[PDB]
């Protein structure tokens, strides 16, 4: 139901006890006017609503994916 | 008469028409005489009358509806209270009032 944007607050979610699962979505999407780029969304499934964190930067995308708790049960695509 | 005096205050002196402005006269002390209409509600009444005695200004209860108080000051609209800042050539301050 929810959308999130403080990249930190997100990280604190994916370490919030009741959050067994999570999933990451990769979309082709266009930049400004001309070309495309690789949008990615970081969906945390909390016990009562589903918070999703849009990370426009394809670069921060790669280092964040590593940031994910290694006992979190992520589902890529 | 009482309207004849008003007509003299009206073409020689300074006044303000209406509630809001005649309070700024009572806080500044600039009022010499406020003229209250007949139908103007007792709260607006008693509230000026408290404002009045807090600046020692005298209060003349005009005995006619705000609508005729409007003809009294020569304006085409009603007024529920006047305030006399300067008595021009008239004598309202220093007669019966």
């Amino acid at each position: 139901a929810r959308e999130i944007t403080d990249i930190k607050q997100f990280l604190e979610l994916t370490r919030r006890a009741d959050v067994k699962t999570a999933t990451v979505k990769i979309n082709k999407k266009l930049n400004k006017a001309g070309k495309p780029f690789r949008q990615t969304k970081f969906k945390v499934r909390g016990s009562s609503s589903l918070y999703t964190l849009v990370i426009n930067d394809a670069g921060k995308a790669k280092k964040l994916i590593q940031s994910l708790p290694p006992t979190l049960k992520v589902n890529r695509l | 008469s009482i309207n004849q005096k008003l007509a003299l205050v009206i073409k020689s002196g300074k006044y303000t028409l209406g509630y809001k402005s005649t309070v700024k006269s009572l806080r500044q002390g600039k009022s010499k005489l406020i003229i209250i209409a007949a139908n103007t509600p007792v709260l607006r009444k008693s509230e000026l009358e408290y404002y009045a005695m807090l600046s020692k200004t005298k209060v003349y209860y005009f005995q006619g509806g705000n609508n005729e108080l409007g003809t009294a000051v020569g304006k085409l609209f009603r007024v529920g209270v006047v305030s006399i800042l300067e008595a021009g050539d008239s004598d309202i301050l220093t007669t019966l009032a």
Partner: protein
């Protein structure tokens, strides 16, 4: 709708002044005014008829 007013924060059911979600400010403006003068005037009547009593 009225059963929805128990699914909401209290700050959704008032404004901070006295008589928040009861009266409409102006109507509170008046009753402050009215009460004060009338409570003043009350006094005004007290000591005047203490004067009529001792001076009759």
């Amino acid at each position: 709708r009225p059963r929805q007013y128990a699914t909401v924060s209290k700050t959704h059911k008032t404004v901070s002044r006295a008589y928040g979600g009861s009266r409409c400010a102006n109507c509170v403006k008046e009753r402050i005014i009215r009460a004060f003068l009338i409570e003043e005037q009350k006094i005004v009547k007290k000591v005047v008829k203490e004067q009529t009593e001792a001076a009759k």
